[PDB]
């Protein structure tokens, strides 16, 4: 239940997002399974080559500071990241739209 999904798997994230009900920009935030201390923004997309597909963006945190996907654009928290990208794609595949249901 969203937007923070905590310790779900990459593949489980993907199975959730890829519900055909879900529009482009459907998203969740999870822990990164593989980088410890990182988080992950997982977003549903579409192209006519791949069809329905998902992109994953690592969210790093500086020790000393803020959260980021790109290091020139930082946030003092995860809700501020999410609020930003809800208004602007700014290099993401798509603007954040629905939170992932379930
Ligand atoms: C295999 C994979 O998904 N890697 C992920 C990263 C990841 C790793 C571990 C995670 O943790 P976990 O193991 O739990 O999933 C979660 C996510 C990945 O590279 N995404 C791509 C972007 C999505 C895509 O275009 O696909 C990525 O960073 N692009 C970078 C940077 C691109 C830019 C684009 C402009 C805005 C700032 C980012 C690159 N190439 O310069």
From Swiss-Prot:
Shown segment, full-protein numbering: 146 to 247 of 526
Entry similarity comment: Belongs to the protein kinase superfamily. Tyr protein kinase family. SRC subfamily.
Source species of the chain: Rous sarcoma virus subgroup A (strain Schmidt-Ruppin)
Record PTM: The phosphorylated form is termed pp60v-src.
Oligomer status and interactors: Homodimer.
Protein's UniProt name: Tyrosine-protein kinase transforming protein Src
Domain SH2 intervals: 3-100
Organism domain of life: Viruses
Role of this protein: This phosphoprotein, required for both the initiation and the maintenance of neoplastic transformation, is a protein kinase that catalyzes the phosphorylation of tyrosine residues in vitro. Causes mitotic slippage in addition to cytokinesis failure in the host cell. Phosphorylates and attenuates the activity of host CDK1, possibly causing the mitotic slippage.
């Amino acid at each position: 239940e969203e937007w923070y999904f905590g310790k779900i798997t990459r593949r489980e994230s993907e199975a959730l997002l890829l519900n055909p009900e879900n529009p482009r920009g459907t998203f969740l935030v999870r822990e990164s399974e593989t980088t410890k201390g990182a988080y992950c923004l997982s977003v549903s997309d579409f192209d006519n080559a791949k069809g329905l597909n998902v992109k994953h963006y690592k969210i790093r945190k500086l020790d000393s500071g803020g959260f980021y996907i790109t290091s020139r654009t930082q946030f003092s928290s995860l809700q501020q990241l999410v609020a930003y990208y809800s208004k602007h794609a700014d290099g993401l595949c798509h603007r954040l739209t629905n939170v992932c249901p379930t």
